[PDB]
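Annotators were shown the component list below and the corresponding predicted structure, then asked to write short factual statements about the assembly.
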Amino acid sequence: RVEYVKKERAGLRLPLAAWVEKEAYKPGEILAELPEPYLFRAEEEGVVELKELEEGAFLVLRREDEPVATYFLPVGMTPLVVHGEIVEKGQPLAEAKGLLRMPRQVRAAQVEAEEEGETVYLTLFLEWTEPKDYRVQPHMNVVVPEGARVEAGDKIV
Amino acid sequence: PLLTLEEEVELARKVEEGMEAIKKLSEITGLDPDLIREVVRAKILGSARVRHIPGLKETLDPKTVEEIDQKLKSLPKEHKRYLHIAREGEAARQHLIEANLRLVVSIAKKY
DNA sequence: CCTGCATCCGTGAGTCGAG
DNA sequence: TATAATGGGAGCTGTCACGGATGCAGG
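Structure shown to annotators:
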């Protein structure tokens, strides 16, 4: 099982009062508390790429190929869209209910917050790990030990 | 006990890579491949077995196996790797021979 | 543990002749 | 020098009596 380290940048917009203000967010730590269901709307137009994790997900919006948007969906927010779907500015991408928090897999290193109206658009720098399994036949052998860090191009088996 | 396929493959691999490592150490130190092989084997088997080999150009006493072992250990790290490779190669060889001994019985029972 | 009896193991079992 | 093969096989049976050592239950 190779856990691949990935660090990206994704925005999330929330009601201003509901947000619990913190410099950074530990995995599982409460991101906010909602008095009432809040739909998280699309701020850009394009096709949707939904990348789902063990818990929580990523919405990558794009026109042509190059991504025009990257949104992060934390725990407690149920996605309202499918993969490969057309969305326009203002239509709900997902639905957040009650208390929402960070996934146990991913951690937010730094948070850039912006005041706009009654909301705040958080720019998250997120770090997580995506696992990939490799089946080993009896005729092969593992050249790497337990918990050993490998870079790109390095031989495992 | 009898080997599982993975163990068979593993031992064979260790043996082959061990021989390759011996050729490598021969290319490095400049000694006889047979000499190096018999020194590695001497260290793997134990202190119990050291005996003059008809093939070697020199008498192999523990004194000489220690001289050669000391000339092998004093090599640079990346070169010293092949020593360990060869050692585990010989151990794997012993284990491999000892593992398949039943086959010899079942073959010789027909003769 | 020291003595005594039960048990196992090895050792023997005529000479010469003829085949 | 390359499918894979992975713990044997016959046994000799109806003598007899000894010395010495070895072992076990009993006083």
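Statements collected:
1. The interface with chain B takes residues 138-139, 141 of chain A (CB under 8 Å).
2. The longest strand of chain A covers residues 2-15.
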